[PDB]
């Protein structure tokens, strides 16, 4: 199914997210507060790992699929519970603790090697016993300041670090030829400005020996200059020299690299002939305006020294969502192929505003010289709610959602149509003085009305920043005898958007019909109290369409009493009279006395779960006849009804962990 996740808002750490090609499963992982999020199979499955601490950095082992996760003064190592399977799963396997310094940045390398730099650039290995994976602090050293970003290559090239705002990158090569306690040889690698980013070139084919040259280092200086530094074994004689320079134009603000690895795995030999750039890697320089230029290096990886230079390939330009959403910084994990989908590169973007974007650029189109605008299309987006969701409130037009918590972190979201299904999109935050007990959304989400457990009725306007401007407020008397149980937006006899007469159902009757509006303050309406059906409303449930229908003639509340006397009540109100009237539209007497859940649709259907909760009964409100009765081995946790202007009613019966969808089936004349 086209199931889209929102696992959790990502952190702002540079290494907060890393894509990795373990066995071509194209794992992706990222840190969100107290959680780690691992998306395994084409991002169609999710695994979340809970840890009682903010996760600083995460990195993935390409060789063996091990995850290294930094937090506080320690690191955790997780391994695929089974080293190979169609549906991988990660479980805790090891712990790393060296000193009392939070592990600011962390990475992974060949054969279980890690460069866990906190302030000292600890280097380790973990893979021993019959599967203890007991780590060995093979090296340790201090730094001028905490490491903001680190990088580790395979084999002799060893490690590089920078530190925040650092202008010289401490290269530590694997100086000692042998011995577990290897000492690392230093180099400064001066730059004219603080490093913005950096990364090693890729060459996995050299394994298992790993003794190879041309470990070129990519480094972007703060002076709009990308730099490629040559490297070679040469008995450790290479190298701290800049091999190639690329000054970005003032329009350019971001840069990314696609290694020869990806091109070789994607383009075929016949296709590789044009533009015939397979001799080196590719570099894409983009600007916030969208426009971007892609170029190819000349002999950027040739073992003998070569005159490296930037040779342009194409001048592309994609939409706003394809490059950046006006973010301050973007962290771009390594671009890797989307598993066996030839010709597609899983470009990722970290927007540092709570959203990660997955684009799936088509490489053959990217390098197309005689080509038009970029074809990148938003494939997935990852974000999440701040703390937790206590309840979800739906706008009856279905185009806005209000997430409410036990705290004041309420959010107004809108569904967003991606290239792969649909996903929510936070648009505003409704800050509240106390938890919202009930609420109702209007104006396609731009206006919100809520009632707090404190009793305050508050009305916000949300026209845009994410700020929600509280425009009106009022308070109730909170008699502590009767209490509200639902809020029904009683439609006006005519389509009216100026005011929204909201009815608070104070248990048995006592409909507080406030004429809430924004341009003018909230009011109060006397009429009227409905039949409480025994002086105690038993499990009232609202009726709402989920489509933009302006009809005022509609039943609003499907009340029920412990005797099963369900009653759907219409709503009629006069703005001039400042009074509202409750009319019993239907009174089907149900055969069930105690019901776990109740709901009804716009199309006159109704659903009730028995007292036991394991039997669902579907009833017709226009006939009073039980249309369906099913018995489930598990309790029915919730029910919810959709609809459309074409009567396409669907009922979702939400069980413990999965939700069934049921739909009406035509009565067959010649069958059962």
């Amino acid at each position: 199914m086209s199931l889209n996740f929102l696992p959790g808002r990502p952190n702002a750490t540079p290494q907060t997210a890393c894509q990795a090609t373990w066995q071509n499963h194209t794992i992706f992982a990222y840190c969100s507060g107290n959680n780690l999020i691992i998306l395994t199979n084409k991002f169609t499955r999710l695994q979340t790992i809970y840890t009682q601490s903010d996760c600083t950095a995460v990195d993935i082992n390409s060789q063996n699929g091990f995850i290294a996760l930094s937090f506080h003064n320690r690191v955790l190592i997780y391994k695929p519970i089974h080293q190979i399977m169609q549906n991988p799963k990660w479980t805790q396997c090891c712990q790393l603790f060296h000193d009392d310094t939070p592990v600011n940045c962390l990475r992974w390398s060949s054969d279980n090697e890690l460069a866990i730099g906190s302030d000292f650039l600890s280097f380790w290995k973990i893979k021993d016993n019959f599967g203890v994976y007991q780590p060995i602090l093979q090296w340790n050293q201090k730094q001028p300041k905490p490491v903001y970003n680190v990088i580790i290559s395979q084999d002799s090239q060893l490690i590089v670090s920078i530190g925040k705002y650092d202008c010289n990158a401490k290269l530590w090569k694997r100086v000692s030829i042998v011995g577990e306690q290897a000492i690392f040889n230093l180099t400064m690698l001066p730059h004219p400005k603080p490093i913005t980013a950096m990364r090693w070139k890729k060459e996995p084919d050299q394994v298992s020996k790993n003794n190879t040259a041309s470990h070129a280092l990519y480094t972007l200086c703060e002076d709009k200059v990308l730099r490629i530094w040559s490297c070679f074994e040469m008995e450790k004689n290479h190298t701290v020299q800049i091999w190639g320079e690329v000054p970005l134009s003032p329009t350019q603000k971001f840069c990314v690299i696609i290694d020869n690895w990806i091109i070789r795995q994607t383009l075929s030999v016949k296709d590789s002939e044009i533009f015939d750039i397979s001799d080196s890697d590719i570099v894409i320089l983009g600007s916030m305006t969208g426009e971007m230029e892609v170029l190819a290096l000349n002999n950027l990886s040739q073992d003998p020294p070569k005159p490296m230079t930037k040779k342009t390939i194409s001048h592309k330009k994609v939409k706003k969502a394809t490059m950046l959403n006006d973010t301050r910084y973007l962290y771009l994990p390594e671009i890797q192929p989307y598993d066996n989908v030839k010709g597609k590169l899983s470009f990722l973007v970290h927007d540092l505003q709570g959203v990660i974007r997955h684009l799936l650029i088509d490489i053959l189109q990217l390098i197309n010289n005689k080509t038009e605008d970029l074809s990148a299309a938003l494939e997935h987006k990852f974000t999440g709610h701040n703390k937790s969701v206590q309840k979800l409130v739906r706008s009856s037009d279905g185009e806005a959602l209000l997430t409410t918590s036990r705290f004041s972190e309420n959010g107004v979201w809108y569904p967003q149509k991606l290239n792969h299904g649909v996903s929510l999109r936070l648009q505003n935050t409704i800050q509240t003085e106390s938890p919202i007990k009930f609420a109702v959304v209007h104006e396609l989400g731009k206006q919100v009305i809520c009632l707090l457990e404190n009793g305050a009725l508050q009305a916000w306007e949300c026209p845009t920043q994410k700020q929600s401007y509280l425009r009106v407020e009022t308070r109730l008397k909170e008699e502590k005898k009767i209490h509200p149980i639902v809020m029904l937006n009683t439609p006006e006899p005519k389509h009216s958007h100026e005011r929204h007469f909201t009815a608070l159902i104070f248990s048995d009757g006592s409909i507080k019909a406030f004429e809430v509006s924004l341009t003018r303050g909230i009011f109060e309406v006397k009429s009227d109290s409905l039949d409480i059906d025994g002086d105690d409303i038993y499990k009232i449930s609202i009726i709402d369409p989920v489509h933009q229908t302006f009809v005022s003639n509609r039943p609003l509340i499907s009340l029920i009493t412990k005797k099963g006397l369900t009653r759907t009540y219409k709503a009629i109100v006069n703005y001039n009279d400042r009074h509202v009237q409750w009319i019993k539209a239907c009174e089907i007497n149900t055969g069930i006395m105690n019901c776990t859940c109740i709901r009804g649709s716009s199309t006159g259907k109704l659903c009730i779960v028995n007292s036991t909760g394991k039997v669902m009964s579907l009833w017709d409100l226009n006939r009073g006849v039980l249309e369906y009765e099913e018995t489930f081995h598990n309790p029915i946790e919730d029910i919810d009804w959709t609809s459309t202007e074409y009567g396409q009613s669907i009922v979702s019966i939400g069980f413990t962990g999965y939700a069934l969808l049921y739909t009406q089936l035509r009565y067959d004349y010649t069958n059962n």
């Binding site: 003639n553 006159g604 202007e645 074409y646 009567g647």
Partner: protein
């Protein structure tokens, strides 16, 4: 003259003469001399009759007319208020032998059903 289930209305008027049934059953020709209709739909029918009190129709003498023509827009919106009640409104207009409301209801419901086919759903709902 009014449904027994709590249904009442103007006993007679120029509107009530709109119903060709009441043209004879409404004490017409009193010098020489409703039960079935549901209450709500009776109210709806009298609303329509009051609205068109200032209009004229060719009745059964329309020949090529009385069909194959677009329906009045206000009638379209007035009747398009309930799918399940439209059939019984058509039946009421049938029992009262009121041709114009019958024609309007049939046009409206025919267009509803035509527009509920999957092709029309996809062509007008999402596309």
């Amino acid at each position: 003259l009014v449904s027994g289930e709590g249904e009442r209305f103007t006993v007679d008027k120029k509107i009530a003469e709109r119903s060709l049934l009441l043209k004879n059953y409404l004490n017409d020709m009193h010098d020489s001399n409703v039960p079935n209709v549901r209450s709500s739909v009776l109210q709806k029918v009298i609303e329509w009759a009051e609205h068109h009190r200032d209009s004229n129709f060719p009745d059964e003498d329309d020949d090529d007319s009385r069909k194959s023509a677009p329906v009045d827009s206000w009638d379209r919106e007035f009747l398009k208020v309930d799918q399940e009640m439209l059939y019984e409104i058509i039946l009421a207009a049938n029992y009262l032998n009121i041709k114009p409301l019958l024609d309007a209801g049939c046009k409206v419901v025919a267009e509803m059903i035509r527009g509920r086919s999957p092709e029309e759903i996809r062509r007008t709902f999402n596309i």
